[PDB]
């Protein structure tokens, strides 16, 4: 079993790489913006499965639970990553190093502007709280593990919570400020979940009306709905 500090370091070593994607040469259309964003998502999904497998305890769960967790959390985990990438750039969504979208560029995709505004507002909350790197790592793991072998899972989630509490304690703030910071970080989990629910409705519709074709792993996740 790991100490809180060691668990955090394990999460740090597990971080997935930044997928590279570029703008098309021609101006964005509804179809081409949806193509660039789903292509990004599908590649990230491959690395996400590898990340989850490195979270201590995950591969000891039943293979059924592993499927269920990833199936439930994937959009949330993508959005959390995006928000972290975007945290020091107000008005912008840093999908990848060469795909940095200004808020208004979403005007070309029907319905996406609402979701961009949710992601941007939640990102601003994390900015105002001064979310720290180690806190981000614990929260992202908590998203996976709370998305819902059973004894193992509640234990795993508790270990990650203990790790977050440990990180907050290291900041040196008062006992009541520590409780307050824990509450404020965790209250943002429901905003991430809300944005995921809305993003999933949007993408499912776009797929359904054949605005954008999706393949392989992303296709398989969407067909589950």
């Amino acid at each position: 079993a790991l100490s809180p500090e060691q668990l955090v370091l394990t999460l740090l070593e597990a971080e997935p790489p930044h997928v590279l994607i570029s703008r098309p040469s021609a101006p964005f259309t509804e179809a081409s913006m949806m193509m660039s964003l789903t292509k990004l998502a599908d590649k990230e999904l491959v690395h996400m499965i590898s990340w989850a497998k490195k979270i201590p305890g995950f591969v000891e769960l039943s293979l059924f639970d592993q499927v269920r967790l990833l199936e439930s959390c994937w959009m949330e985990v993508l959005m959390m990553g995006l928000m972290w990438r975007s945290i020091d750039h107000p008005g912008k969504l840093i999908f990848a190093p060469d795909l940095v979208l200004d808020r208004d560029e979403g005007k070309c995709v029907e319905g996406i502007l609402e979701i961009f505004d949710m992601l941007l507002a939640t990102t601003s909350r994390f900015r105002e709280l001064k979310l720290q790197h180690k806190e981000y790592l614990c929260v992202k793991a908590m998203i996976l593990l709370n998305s819902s072998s059973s004894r193992k899972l509640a234990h795993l989630l508790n270990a990650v919570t203990d790790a977050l509490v440990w990180v907050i304690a290291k900041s040196g703030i008062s006992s009541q400020q520590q409780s307050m910071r824990l509450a404020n970080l965790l209250m943002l989990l429901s905003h991430v979940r809300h944005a995921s629910n809305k993003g999933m409705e949007h993408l499912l519709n776009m797929k359904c009306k054949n605005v954008v074709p999706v393949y392989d792993l992303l296709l398989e996740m969407l067909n589950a709905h």
Binding site: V46, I49, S50, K53, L63, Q66, V67, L70, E71, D216, L217, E220, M221, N223, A224
Partner: peptide, 12 residues
């Protein structure tokens, strides 16, 4: 209904 995800989960 998860051939790919299972394969990624099991691959090394």
């Amino acid at each position: 209904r998860h051939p790919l995800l299972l394969r990624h989960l099991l691959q090394n």
